[PDB]
Structure 1
């Protein structure tokens, strides 16, 4: 499986979360592409200058909830 790519419109309409910025979400997806979805590595390399402490499970939940939402809105 590949990392999904969402458009700006898809993010605005369907992917916002009160506790996540689009910048952080884009960072998570960029690291997921660069580090082959190895969440221990993504977690270790996360930008903690800009973004708060997230657990590995928090990163996975964000990534996988976006995957499920995109699957539904693209159907």
Structure 2
């Protein structure tokens, strides 16, 4: 299952100089809807609003957040 971060969690812990919350939210939405199939997530990505991201860029962002949430929720 895809983790769900709170707004406060994002603000305190999940910022990245190269990602908006809007884009991160989009990644996590696609991750839910497409069952973590990163080829599909990559295909369906709103490359209009957001930068061209590699599949690898998307996975690294997702699992950085997973690791950070695991830690702060301990």
State the SS of the aligned residue for 2:59.
Answer: helix
Give the unaligned 5+ runs of structure 2.
none
Please identify runs of 4+ aligned residues in structure 1 that moved more than 3 A: none
Give the unaligned 5+ runs of structure 1.
none
Aligned to 2:31: 32
Q: Over aligned residue pairs, what C-alpha RMSD do you find? A: 0.3
Q: Are residue 59 (structure 1) and residue 58 (structure 2) matched?
A: yes
TM-aligned CA deviation for residue 56 of structure 1: 0.3
Report the TM-score, using the length of structure 2 for normalisation.
0.99
Report the count of equivalent residues: 74
